[PDB]
A paper describes a structure:
TldD/E cleaves the N-terminal leader sequence from the modified MccB17 precursor peptide, to yield mature antibiotic, while it has no effect on the unmodified peptide. Peptide substrates are bound in a sequence-independent manner through β sheet interactions with TldD and are likely cleaved via a thermolysin-type mechanism.
These are roughly spherical, resembling the previously crystallized TldE (PmbA) homodimers, with an average outer diameter of approximately 65 Å and a hollow core. In the TldD/E structure, the TldD HExxxH motif, spanning residues 262–267, is located on the central helix that resides within the β funnel, and with the two histidine residues, His262 and His267, coordinating a metal ion, which we modeled as Zn (because Zn was added to the growth medium); a third ligand is provided by Cys454 from the clamp domain. In our first determined structure of TldD/E, a phosphate anion (derived from the crystallization solution, hence WT-PO4) serves as a fourth ligand to the zinc, which is also held by a bidentate interaction with Glu263. An oxygen atom of this bound phosphate corresponds to the position of the “catalytic” water molecule in thermolysin. The resultant negatively charged tetrahedral intermediate is stabilized through interactions with the zinc; this stage of the reaction is mimicked by the phosphate-bound TldD/E structure.
Author numbering:
A (entry chain B): 7 to 450
B (entry chain A): 2 to 481
The structure:
């Protein structure tokens, strides 16, 4: 596989050089990205192979600039002739677009000319038959857990490697390799004329960082069985815990609200909040783009800009926007290396377990799953479908579904009571469960 | 028809009909029920205006072949981002390994049959000049800004695709399509006394960009849509808190048809029902909606975003009655699930591209009109919501819970529409909510050409539709 990957890497590097050279005579600047992803995706049904999918995807993207006019083109064909056509397409477009001085290649002084090795590449030679056996093991462990499990949506195993190369007309040309492997199962349980489905999974850059198939199956069944016989709450106001998985998404809404694109367009409810307290004064959000093997580690952003260790929130204070080249120029600032998103967020727990948070809350709603969109970028208004558990006397009483929770993110974030030690570790943003003092719950 | 696509996809890439025979033969060396070869090329453009200038433009090209081998429940799948004999051979040889056992090698002779055309074969990317395309956007910007002094920002985009497909299969299917699709999107920001809000409009379909300059009720369509985005932004700017709880909800005609897409649409896709994982599994012949409700999925509609002259397996699009006077009639199928359920293809076998597997997917999903006027429906509510527009939604087909979120909504008080209210997510159970439909309007319309549907990571263009209707009890996710 490493001979295959090194061969792909050389091909991609030449493709970037070729595109940049073809552009150089007819543009003031150009940026070129190429990627290749290869691997396998398999599923099982009742422990037998269902699907075997062989994946092989490639792509080349180019943006060129002339008189501050921009044009872009892309192709999945990396032959020299296809590259020539893609370059000419982008150049032709830039004859019709308008001069826009905030457009252009990222600032030379911010580029990752010598990009760090973040050890993202841990390939595995997994045959389809071996992949199938892993999926089957996870699914069978789920199906054997309890006699109320009566159907399946299957086991699934995925293993891929990727090569990405970026270059631009300031002389940057840097590339890196990565791997991702994952294993999941999803089953259906029934009780008293009600069906429920849930899943469990494990993910990592190295095969030896995964949970066992049998762990996945046990987790899948536990989650699925816990959903049985839900109640629809009556309409009320109560405290709400966002369980760790959805709590990561609660902090996730911050990304849109502090993105430079939203800020310069005045389309964020946090427009006037830079340097002000938006979160509790003990809460810090640490960004760590250079974690070795990190799930969202990156040696540079999508415009080739260096990434840095940053405290996005420090002691409840919003310290910075998330800027790209274009939005930074619009605001008179410099890129913070956030083209393409955020790069590993970490929020520490304040010392309580999940069980202790339930005791602290006493009576209230725990949300474990949210449905729908219902979050306004410009106002912060929040209205989402929810499922979870009702808590009374500090103990889970029954599952709940067919309800909504509503409020405003500005209020929700400012008034967080505590964050748990039960940290979710499979995601970009990693935190524990989050206690909110009050939300409007719509139901019966 | 087939000829033109076959020259572009096969002949231009050094392939003939007999190469198709040979590759399908390679698949049939194993013990399969079915195998297919799916050829595609597509060309996508987009242009974006913001801050009164043309900021961005893009041109995107894709091409490839996907090859499937199917045996009962099982699919092997491989593909390549090129159209060549070697790509075909490599793909077929990988995909057939789904089963180890030898097959009888029997395949039906390849034979194309006529289908009805549903949209032009003229390339929309080439049929209008770039200067005229960009003038559509400039017009949108000018009209929006002239509509109200509070308009501070307008983003307007034009997006077009031209797509050629050819499918050849072991059951003798040989079919081709030429698929145009265009979309105009408008978003506006309004400001008053330091408060800001946004509004949006747009649509399109399977035709050229000239559609945006044609007449809509006595005005130029793009002017009308520019004005609509401004109107929506101004409604939202004035909106007050929505009420929380269970109440009557009156849904407008058209895009509020998202109701159907979420509450029944996905639940009636044959893959979920074959597996027994949908709440509708085994329920054919039962009352799954009020007796006032007839719900169809219709791939035959001339020029529409959601239509399929052929689906991605070569099956001509069909008018499929799913629910008739409240009674479940059947499911949307692809070839695989049809065989496994002992049913027949319905024209719902769709894939995002050559690089993805087809499955049962919606086309244009709507409710047939009834006898009530929209005014009668509004007048019947003492206290509730009127919601003439929505964003998107979501459904859990197993537990039968679904949501959809309002983008324009109002209180109804004493049978009159009163105060505009803020965006709220509405939640219910699919079958139970459909059973609460007590009034069905005489004013059926489909959406303007905006639908995007997701399933298993695959995005597709869809349509939805309905008349004005009344749900007697639905949970509204307000704060007040
Ligand atoms: Zn959908």
């Amino acid at each position: 596989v490493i001979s295959q990957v090194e061969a792909q890497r050389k091909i991609l590097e030449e493709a970037v050089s070729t595109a940049l050279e073809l552009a150089s005579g007819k543009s003031d600047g150009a940026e070129v990205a190429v990627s290749k992803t290869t691997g396998i995706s398999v599923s099982t049904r009742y422990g037998e192979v269902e699907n075997v999918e062989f994946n092989s995807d490639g792509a080349l993207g180019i943006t060129v600039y002339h008189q501050n006019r921009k044009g872009s083109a892309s192709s999945t064909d990396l032959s020299p002739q296809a590259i020539a056509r893609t370059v000419q397409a982008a150049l032709d477009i830039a004859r019709y677009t308008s001069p826009d001085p905030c457009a252009g290649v990222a600032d030379k002084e911010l580029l990752a000319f010598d990009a760090p090795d973040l050890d993202l590449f841990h390939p595995a030679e997994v045959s389809p038959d071996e992949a199938i056996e892993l999926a089957a093991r996870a699914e069978q462990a789920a199906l054997q857990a309890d006699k109320r499990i009566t159907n399946t949506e299957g086991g699934s195993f995925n293993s891929h490697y990727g090569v990405k190369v970026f270059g631009n007309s300031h002389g940057m040309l840097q590339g890196y390799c990565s791997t991702r492997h994952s294993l999941s199962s999803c089953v259906i349980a029934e009780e008293n004329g009600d069906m429920e489905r849930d899943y469990a999974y494990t993910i990592g850059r190295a095969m030896s960082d995964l949970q066992t198939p049998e762990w996945v199956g046990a987790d899948c069944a536990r989650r699925t069985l816990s959903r049985l016989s839900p109640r629809k709450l009556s309409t009320m106001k109560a405290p709400v815990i966002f369980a760790n998985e959805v709590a990561t998404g609660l902090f996730g809404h911050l990304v849109g609200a502090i993105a430079g694109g939203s800020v310069y367009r005045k389309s964020t409810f946090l427009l006037d909040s830079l340097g002000k307290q938006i979160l509790p004064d003990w809460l810090t959000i640490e960004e760590h783009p250079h974690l070795l093997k990190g799930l969202a580690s990156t040696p540079f952003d999508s415009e080739g800009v260096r990434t840095e260790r940053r405290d996005i929130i420090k002691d409840g204070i919003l310290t910075q926007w998330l800027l790209t080249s274009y939005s930074a120029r619009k605001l008179g600032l410099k890129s913070t290396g956030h083209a393409g998103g955020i790069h590993n967020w970490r929020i520490a727990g304040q010392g309580l377990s999940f069980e202790q948070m339930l005791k602290e809350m006493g009576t209230g709603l725990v949300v474990t799953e949210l449905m729908g969109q219902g979050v306004s970028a410009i106002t912060g208004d929040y209205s989402r479908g929810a499922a979870g558990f009702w808590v009374e006397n500090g103990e889970i009483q029954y599952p709940v579904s067919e309800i909504t929770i509503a409020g405003n993110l500005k209020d929700m974030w400012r008034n967080i009571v505590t964050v748990g030690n039960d940290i979710e570790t499979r995601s970009n943003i990693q935190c524990g469960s989050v206690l909110l003092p009050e939300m409007k719950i719509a139901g019966q | 028809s087939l000829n033109l696509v076959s020259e572009q996809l096969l002949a231009a890439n050094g392939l003939k009909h007999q190469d198709l025979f040979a590759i399908l033969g390679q698949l049939a060396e194993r013990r399969l029920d079915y195998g297919d070869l799916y050829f595609q090329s597509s060309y996508h453009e987009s242009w974006v205006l913001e801050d009164r200038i043309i900021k961005d433009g893009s041109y995107n090209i894709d091409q490839g072949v996907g090859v499937r081998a199917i045996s009962g429940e099982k699919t092997g799948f491989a593909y390549a981002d090129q159209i060549s004999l070697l790509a075909l051979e490599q793909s077929a040889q990988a995909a057939r390994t789904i089963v180890r056992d030898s097959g009888d090698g029997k395949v039906q002779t390849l034979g194309a049959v006529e289908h009805s055309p549903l949209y032009t074969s003229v390339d929309p990317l080439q049929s209008m000049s770039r200067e005229e395309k960009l003038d559509i956007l400039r017009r949108v910007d000018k009209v929006a800004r002239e509509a109200d002094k509070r308009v501070q920002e307008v983003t307007a985009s034009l997006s077009g695709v031209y797509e050629l497909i050819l499918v050849a299969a072991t059951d003798g299917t040989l079919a081709a399509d030429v698929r145009p699709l265009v979309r105009l999107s408008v978003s506006v920001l309004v400001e008053e006394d330091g408060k800001r809000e946004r509004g949006a409009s747009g649509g399109g379909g399977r035709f050229g960009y000239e559609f945006f300059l044609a007449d809509l009720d006595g005005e130029v369509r793009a002017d009308a849509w520019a004005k609509e985005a401004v109107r929506m932004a101004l409604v939202n700017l004035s909106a007050v808190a929505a009420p929380a709880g269970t109440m009557p909800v009156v849904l407008g005609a058209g895009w509020p048809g998202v109701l159907l897409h979420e509450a029944v649409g996905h639940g009636l896709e044959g893959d979920f029902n074959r597996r027994g994982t949908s709440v509708f599994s085994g329920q054919v012949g039962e009352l799954v909606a009020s007796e006032l409700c007839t719900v169809v999925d219709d791939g035959t509609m001339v020029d529409r975003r959601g239509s399929v002259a052929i689906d991605d397996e070569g099956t001509p699009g069909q008018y499929n009655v799913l629910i008739e006077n409240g009674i479940l009639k059947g499911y949307m199928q692809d070839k695989l699930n049809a065989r496994l359920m002992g049913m027949t293809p319905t024209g719902n076998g769709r894939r995002e591209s050559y690089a993805h597997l087809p499955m049962p997917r919606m086309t244009n999903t709507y409710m047939l009109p009834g006898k009530s006027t929209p005014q009668e429906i509004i007048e019947s509510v003492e206290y509730g919501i009127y919601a003439p527009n929505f964003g998107g939604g979501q459904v859990d087909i197993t537990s039968d819970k679904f949501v959809f979120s309002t983008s324009e909504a109002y209180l109804i008080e004493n049978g009159k529409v009163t105060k505009p209210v803020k965006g709220a997510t509405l939640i219910g159970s699919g079958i139970e909510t459909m059973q609460q439909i007590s009034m069905v309007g005489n004013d059926l319309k489909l959406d303007n050409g905006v639908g995007v549907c997701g399933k298993e990571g695959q995005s597709l263009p869809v349509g939805v539709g309905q008349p004005t209707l009344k749900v007697d009890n639905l949970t509204v996710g307000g704060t007040a």
